[PDB]
Ligand binder design. Structure first.
Ligand SMILES: O=C(O)C1=C[C@H](O)[C@@H](O)[C@@H](O[C@@H]2[C@H](O)[C@@H](O)[C@@H](O)O[C@@H]2C(=O)O)O1
Ligand SMILES: O=C(O)[C@H]1O[C@H](O)[C@H](O)[C@@H](O)[C@H]1O
Ligand SMILES: O=C[C@H](O)[C@@H](O)[C@@H](O)[C@H](O)C(=O)O
Ligand SMILES: [Ca+2]
Ligand SMILES: [Ca+2]
Ligand SMILES: [Ca+2]
Ligand SMILES: [Ca+2]
Ligand SMILES: [Ca+2]
Length: 195
C-alpha cells in the first residue's frame, strides 16, 4: 500500500459518504481527543460509514476509541485494529455489513457490536486477545444473522458470539478457535449452524 509507513493523526471522526470508498492505502490512523480506548461508552468512532459507504486498507492504531460505526450496506476490507478500543465496529442501522480480511487485537470486551437487525459477515479474519468476537446488543430480540467464514480466533475470554435473541442465527464455515471458554451464548445451541 502506497501510504504504508505514514501515520495520520485525526481529531475528529472521518465520515465516509454513501456510495464512496475510503481507501487508506495502508495508512495508520491515530486518533486524538476522541477517547482513550477504555470501556467508557462515551468515545467517538474513528470512522462513520454511512449507508452504502465502504472502507479499506487502514490500520487503526491505539487508541481504538469507538472504532467503526456502520449504518448498513457497508464493506470493510483489510482493516487492522492494532488495539481495539471500547469495541472495533458497531452496526448502527439495518443492512448488510461485511468485514473481509484484516484482524483485531486486544479487545477488552467486544470486537463487533450489533445494535440493529442486520446480516453480518466476518470473512478471512483473525483476532487475538478478545472478550467476544460478536455481540448482539444485550437483551434485544430483533434478528441478526451472523456469518463467520475462514475466521481464526486466539484467546477468547468470554465467548465467540453472544445473543439474547431466539430468532437470531450464527452460521460458521472454517472457524478455528484456540483458548476459548465457551464458543456460543445464545438462547438455544440450535441457533448455531455450520455450512
Ligand atoms: O459494551 C458493553 O459493555 C456491553 C454491551 C452489551 O450490549 C451489553 O449486553 C453489556 O454487555 C455485558 C457487560 O456489561 C459487558 O461489560 C461485558 O461483560 O459483556 C456483557 C455481555 O453480555 O456481552 O455491555
Ligand atoms: O428464519 C429464517 O428465515 C430462516 O431460518 C433458517 O435459516 C432456515 O435455514 C431458513 O430456511 C429460513 O427459515
Ligand atoms: O443498551 C445499551 C446501549 O446500547 C450501549 O451500551 C451501547 O452504546 C453499546 O454498548 C455499544 O457500544 O454500542
Ligand atoms: Ca464494553
Ligand atoms: Ca459498548
Ligand atoms: Ca461502542
Ligand atoms: Ca484494547
Ligand atoms: Ca430461522
Amino acid at each position: 500500500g502506497t501510504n504504508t509507513g505514514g501515520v495520520l493523526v485525526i481529531t475528529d471522526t472521518i465520515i465516509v459518504k454513501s456510495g464512496q470508498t475510503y481507501d487508506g492505502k495502508g495508512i495508520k490512523i491515530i486518533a486524538q481527543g476522541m477517547g482513550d480506548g477504555s470501556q467508557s461508552e462515551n468515545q467517538k468512532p474513528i470512522f462513520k460509514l454511512e449507508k452504502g459507504a465502504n472502507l479499506k486498507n487502514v490500520i487503526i492504531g491505539a487508541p481504538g476509541c469507538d472504532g467503526i460505526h456502520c449504518y448498513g450496506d457497508n464493506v470493510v476490507e483489510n482493516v487492522v485494529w492494532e488495539d481495539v478500543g471500547e469495541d472495533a465496529l458497531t452496526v448502527k442501522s439495518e443492512g448488510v455489513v461485511e468485514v473481509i480480511g484484516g484482524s483485531a487485537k486486544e479487545a477488552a470486551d467486544k470486537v463487533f457490536q450489533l445494535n440493529a437487525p442486520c446480516t453480518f459477515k466476518v470473512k478471512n479474519f483473525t483476532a487475538t486477545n478478545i472478550g467476544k468476537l460478536v455481540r448482539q446488543n444485550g437483551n434485544t430480540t430483533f434478528k441478526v444473522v451472523i456469518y463467520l467464514e475462514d475466521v481464526t480466533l486466539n484467546n477468547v475470554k468470554s465467548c465467540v458470539a453472544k445473543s439474547d435473541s431466539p430468532v437470531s442465527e450464527l452460521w460458521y464455515h472454517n472457524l478455528n478457535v484456540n483458548n476459548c471458554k465457551t464458543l456460543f451464548e445464545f438462547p438455544s445451541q440450535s441457533q448455531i449452524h455450520q455450512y
